């Protein structure tokens, strides 16, 4: 199927698939309202495209107003994702070091996004998780990792 | 082209196929056009074709959030010039404004934002005054709602038919 | 967060970069 | 400057 058909599938069906919920990994996520498939899409990630220049200048105005998480997500060198102020239930996808889903970035019309996609069939009532990537940044600002897995790495830094 | 929306209208608003003239169907329901403006000044038309007994219309400019199924005005997110009575509306309050419209009349509608935000309505050419300054920040888009079956049709541009007087803009259809 | 469904590009203004 | 990635 030409990606752009499986995506107005996903755009079409993602609402009906999945659902914000309470967290037992930290406080909200997204959990699994039906049956999903290996390699399915399951949501995009959506937001503000912007250029990468603009990412610093962005991310000190939003500690300047107080906002804890990160929820800036890097397309390529060239651009990235703003979902701080405006965005989807993908928002509230928590990490995890065994996740079941991953990221990947897909061109629709000369024009990126990213889509997690389901790395397994995927069960009702699962958390959906992806690794977040984070860069590595020194012990006075790790993160440490509540996702539960057996091979959990401790902290998302 | 710009044109009234395909999907981001009430359903009960009957769209002609050209999607520049729409008929309303009992209360109040709204349908914006297919392009909106962050900063700048523009300009659209709304000519009245028909207006029969007991029905009206409230027209302006909407944020994508207006409520469809409800006057333009009703909310936050829009602002609105009534025929009848020539009544603006913001956030369901009417205030005094102009002299009403109807049949036949030909409206104007400026915005400005620029990047001291204005909103200015005009009746065939001539400024009825400021209605609305310091304007919500956001998209705004050119905007119809309707009360019964009344009939309207909106020019987006680039020719209009009564250009203001020392105003300066570019027409909606600059967006296409 | 407002609500999107699709991706929206922002928009830079000429002053975009400027003190 | 901390994004979420596809790839380090
Ligand atoms: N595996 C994990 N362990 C602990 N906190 C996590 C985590 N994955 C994500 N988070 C937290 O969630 C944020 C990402 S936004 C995810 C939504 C968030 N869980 C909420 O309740 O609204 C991160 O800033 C991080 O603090
Ligand atoms: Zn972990």
Known sequence: ???PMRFRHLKKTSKEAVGVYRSPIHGRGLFCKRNIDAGEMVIEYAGIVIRSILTDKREKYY??????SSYMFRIDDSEVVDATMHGNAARFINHSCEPNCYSRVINIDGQKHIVIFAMRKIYRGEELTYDYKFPI????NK????????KCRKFLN | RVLLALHDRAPQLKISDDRLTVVGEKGYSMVRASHGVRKGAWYFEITVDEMPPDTAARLGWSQPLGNLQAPLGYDKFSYSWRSKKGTKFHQSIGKHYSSGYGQGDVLGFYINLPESSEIIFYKNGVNQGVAYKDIFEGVYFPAISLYKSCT?????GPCF???PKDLTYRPMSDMG | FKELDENVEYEER?????? | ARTKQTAR
């Open chain 2, 152 to 156: 309207v049709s909106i020019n987006f």
């Open chain 1, 137 to 140: 940044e020194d012990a006075s």
């Open chain 1, 1 to 3: 199927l030409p990606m």
């Open chain 1, 63 to 68: 500690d300047s107003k107080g906002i804890g």
């Open chain 2, 161 to 163: 038919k009564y250009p």
């Open chain 3, 14 to 19: 000429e002053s975009e970069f400027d003190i």
């Open chain 1, 143 to 150: 993160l440490p990792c509540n996702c539960g897995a057996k």
